[PDB]
Enzyme design. Structure first.
Site, PDB file in Angstrom:
ATOM      1  N   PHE A 219       6.821  -3.433 -28.802  1.00 38.87           N
ATOM      2  CA  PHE A 219       5.202  -3.064 -29.040  1.00 38.87           C
ATOM      3  C   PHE A 219       4.554  -4.173 -29.235  1.00 38.87           C
ATOM      4  O   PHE A 219       4.801  -5.168 -29.950  1.00 38.87           O
ATOM      5  CB  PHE A 219       5.408  -2.089 -30.619  1.00 38.87           C
ATOM      6  CG  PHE A 219       6.066  -0.682 -30.582  1.00 38.87           C
ATOM      7  CD1 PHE A 219       6.086  -0.229 -29.393  1.00 38.87           C
ATOM      8  CD2 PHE A 219       5.989  -0.130 -31.642  1.00 38.87           C
ATOM      9  CE1 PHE A 219       7.043   1.070 -29.432  1.00 38.87           C
ATOM     10  CE2 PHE A 219       6.531   1.154 -31.708  1.00 38.87           C
ATOM     11  CZ  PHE A 219       6.754   1.650 -30.327  1.00 38.87           C
ATOM     12  N   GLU A 220       3.502  -4.368 -28.147  1.00 44.46           N
ATOM     13  CA  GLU A 220       2.727  -5.518 -28.205  1.00 44.46           C
ATOM     14  C   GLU A 220       1.212  -5.005 -28.178  1.00 44.46           C
ATOM     15  O   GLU A 220       1.001  -3.604 -27.835  1.00 44.46           O
ATOM     16  CB  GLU A 220       2.935  -6.333 -26.927  1.00 44.46           C
ATOM     17  CG  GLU A 220       4.479  -6.864 -26.893  1.00 44.46           C
ATOM     18  CD  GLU A 220       4.446  -7.636 -25.614  1.00 44.46           C
ATOM     19  OE1 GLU A 220       3.861  -8.301 -25.413  1.00 44.46           O
ATOM     20  OE2 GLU A 220       5.758  -7.473 -25.140  1.00 44.46           O
ATOM     21  N   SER A 221       0.272  -5.844 -28.556  1.00 51.92           N
ATOM     22  CA  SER A 221      -0.976  -5.427 -28.836  1.00 51.92           C
ATOM     23  C   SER A 221      -1.274  -4.397 -29.927  1.00 51.92           C
ATOM     24  O   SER A 221      -1.982  -3.514 -29.592  1.00 51.92           O
ATOM     25  CB  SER A 221      -1.712  -4.914 -27.497  1.00 51.92           C
ATOM     26  OG  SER A 221      -1.782  -5.915 -26.189  1.00 51.92           O
TER      27      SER A 221
END
Length: 429
Positions: A219-221
């Site tokens: 999970f990024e941003s």
């Protein structure tokens, strides 16, 4: 206990090197994935059999480095050669190297196809690399706002490749929507209990279906306001994973605890929950920036040291790029993105355009510049046997759990051979 790295010098061929070191041309070609018809490039790093317990000093070597490389205590290496611990070495100097003791390592490699169906060449690369892997990470299953997953093509095929080689396939889950990481997507999943419960249920059924015994969240941003909601989600998954399953996450690289984009990756909290983390210790030099080393070893060490201050060292998997980039000069905003190159392709550029490969001993990385047929200057930074050996020695010094490679499909035969020379590769299958 016979392989070493040798840097190609002016006039060398596979034939002359085999003659010099008493090897065969065929062995040098095979071990280095060469085209036997092609010339060697000055500055190219090869692996060569120089006989058991026998080593010829390379540029920049120290007794300390050689002892780290061959897993032998420095005092023993110095003593058996009648040398002082900081003794001045010269290139070509012959040393006796006692048999060392290998530590274990966990290795991960990511697979990210760009076509449907997956290219045959990419499936073949996956099969070639699988024996060297603790984990195989098929990138990715995309999370959806209804708590279901978008499955990537031929998942059963890829998981079966892993399983047949005692490699654990990871269930890699991303918060990607329409090709981009999405804060809005994780806000739904991390804040709505009904959807999250369905999500975790679907994740477990998917993992059990494909034998994916590690569940991995990339999970990024993620919005800063969701930092603790992400921590709670990870606790919720961890508590519900059955025996024999593990949990892992991707972390952006950090060198301190307050250094807003970053906040949602809580090193301390995640380290307390998960079985391991993959830290993206690469892309200092990157596709959209100016030319420089992709993963300079000083900054990478800083990130590993910061990570160790926040969590147990065994949980840390050091991210490692297999790609380099070819940048056109001068760098300017609006330029096209740099072209990603494999280690083999990088050497092929230096061969084609008749320039030697240089080595930056501060960054610990190979590089070169050339002019193409249109007179445009290029600069290339990439990965080779020298810099990967430096990274392996860093792992040893820092005592971390393993290494995670991005990505399959970038030929670099020396990396995989050196991995097994340096370490015992853990197989959990």
């Amino acid at each position: 206990f016979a392989i070493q790295i040798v840097t190609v010098r002016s006039g060398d061929s596979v034939y002359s090197l085999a003659s010099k070191y008493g090897s065969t041309p065929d062995e040098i070609v095979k071990d280095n994935g060469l085209n036997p018809a092609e010339t060697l490039v000055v500055g190219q790093a090869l692996i060569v059999n120089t006989k058991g317990n026998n080593y010829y000093v390379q540029p920049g070597d120290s007794l300390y480095r050689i002892s780290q490389t061959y897993n032998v205590p420095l005092a023993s290496l110095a003593k058996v050669n009648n040398l002082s611990l900081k003794s001045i070495l010269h290139v070509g100097q012959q040393l006796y190297v006692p048999k060392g003791t290998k530590r274990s390592v966990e290795s991960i490699a990511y697979l990210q196809p760009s076509t449907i169906p997956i290219k045959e060449s990419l499936v073949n690369a996956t099969r070639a690399i699988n024996p060297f892997l603790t984990y195989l990470a098929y990138f990715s299953f995309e999370a959806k706002r209804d708590g279901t997953l978008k499955e990537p093509t031929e998942t059963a095929k890829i998981a079966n490749i892993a399983t047949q080689g005692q490699t654990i396939p990871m269930l890699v889950i991303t918060n990607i929507e329409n090709g981009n990481f999405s804060a809005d997507l994780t806000s739904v999943i991390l804040r709505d209990a009904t959807i999250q419960n369905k999500f975790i249920t679907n994740i477990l059924q998917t993992a059990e279906k494909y034998g994916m015994r590690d569940i991995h969240f990339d999970f990024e941003s993620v919005a800063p306001e969701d930092r603790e909601a992400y921590n709670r989600f990870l606790r919720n998954v961890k508590i519900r994973l059955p025996s024999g399953y593990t949990l892992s996450t991707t972390l952006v690289p950090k060198t301190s605890s307050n250094q807003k984009f970053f906040e949602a990756h809580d090193y301390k909290a995640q380290g307390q929950i998960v079985d391991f983390v993959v830290i993206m210790t690469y892309d200092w030099g990157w596709q959209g920036g100016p030319p420089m080393a992709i993963s300079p070893i000083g900054p990478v060490k800083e990130v590993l040291q910061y990570a160790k201050s926040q969590m147990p060292p065994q949980k840390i998997m050091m991210g490692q790029n297999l790609y380099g980039f070819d940048w056109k000069l001068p760098f300017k905003q609006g330029n096209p993105p740099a072209k990603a190159v494999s280690s083999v392709a990088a050497v092929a550029l230096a061969r084609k355009y008749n320039v030697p490969i240089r080595y930056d001993f501060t960054a610990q990385a190979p590089h070169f510049n050339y002019f193409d047929e249109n007179g445009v200057q290029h600069e290339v930074w990439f990965e080779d046997a020298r810099s990967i050996q430096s990274k392996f020695n860093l792992m040893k010094e820092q005592g971390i759990g393993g290494i995670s490679y991005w990505k399959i499909g970038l030929p670099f035969p020396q990396n995989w051979r050196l991995l097994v020379e340096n370490f015992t590769i853990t197989k959990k299958g």
